[PDB]
Subunit: 152 residues, 3 copies
């Protein structure tokens, strides 16, 4: 029993070391292209791509396109967009049913921050969504190129 | 004994929370300049350099130039090459014995994906190896500049 | 007991795996924009900004502008500057009292590596500090754009 006790004490020190070391690396890793908010992490690729390409990049990386589900998440995402000074694509589209935006899973939106008058399906061909540097949303043509930002 | 149990129960909760956090941060880390395959991790510096300089960058970083040892590893590396649209240097050279490519350790290749007609030692001076966006290999002069991709 | 001893072995296995995985990840993260020295880590954003903007970026990331406090730290920082071939801003300034450089906290410098003749407050308007590829320091106008390097 004393042997196991010694083992536990050792593990406690090793875990404490990992926690401290990892806490430091979290900050290092997110600088300058990442943003943590709650349990979610947004990270930009630093370049622009059309929706389909951006979506694939995020999915293959084990995440998905930025999908802010609260004002707080949206504000965090906005910080990255502002820092890079490039509007970015969100994950939602109304490709299936015009006028009804959904997440990649098909679920309807639980949050939105549409600019006044949006979505307006301008030209009758805007089924993707972009977030501006001011944090507001606008439906935009999926064929256009916007900043690639994924969430993990 | 009873106190040790709860101590173990607690410590493991912390470790599993650490495992989850670490796993999330690893995915974030690899986007968009890295690729994991098995226990190996490829990461590109995002710029080009001549072989000697590229090799030094990887060694100083605690790794080595990309050394795909299987079709799976080659495919993973190919993803970075395609993403950057820049052919990359591999670690192998036939500088010691012309025609015989080896890893930095001196060991002979256990896998190769030479493009048709390669390695041809063009000009009688191609002792380094580059991987194209199509995943195939070609021997090339070490003085040329290619994408820097290290493996860890 | 025999069950506790079993749980401990599993826990030990999880911690040992994390130590190996974390160590590998650290190397990946630092390549190619980071440098570890002592308990400090320098990381460059890979781009240039005026002092105020560079300072805010580091602060918002949970760190601060590079603040070498020893020859060892300065040498580590110098590596990033050399690697990017771009002089970088340090955190210190004499904005409060001309001729007296201080850290962000307000404390006086505990180490300096001024190039010959510096600081010279050229034009009567140099209150910020930059580090050259040779590791030496020079006071520079805060409005100029230099490589952003933060410390964590
Ligand atoms: Ca439509
Ligand atoms: Ca639409
Ligand atoms: Ca619109
Ligand atoms: Ca030769
Ligand atoms: Ca040759
Ligand atoms: Ca050839
Ligand atoms: Ca002054
Ligand atoms: Ca001054
Ligand atoms: Ca000066």
């Amino acid at each position: 029993v004393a042997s196991l006790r010694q083992q536990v004490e050792a593990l406690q020190g090793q875990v404490q070391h990992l926690q401290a070391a990892f806490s430091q690396y979290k900050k290092v890793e997110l600088f300058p292209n990442g943003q943590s908010v709650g349990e979610k992490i947004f990270k930009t690729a630093g370049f622009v791509k059309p929706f389909t390409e951006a979506q694939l990049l995020c999915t293959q990386a084990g995440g998905q396109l930025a999908s802010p589900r609260s004002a707080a998440e949206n504000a965090a995402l906005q910080q990255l967009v502002v820092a890079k000074n490039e509007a970015a694509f969100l994950s939602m589209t109304d490709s299936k049913t015009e006028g009804k935006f959904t997440y990649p899973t098909g679920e309807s939106l639980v949050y939105s921050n549409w600019a006044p008058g949006e979505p307006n399906d301008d030209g009758g061909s805007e089924d993707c969504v972009e977030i501006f540097t001011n944090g507001k949303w606008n439906d935009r043509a999926c064929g256009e190129k916007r900043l690639v930002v994924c969430e993990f």
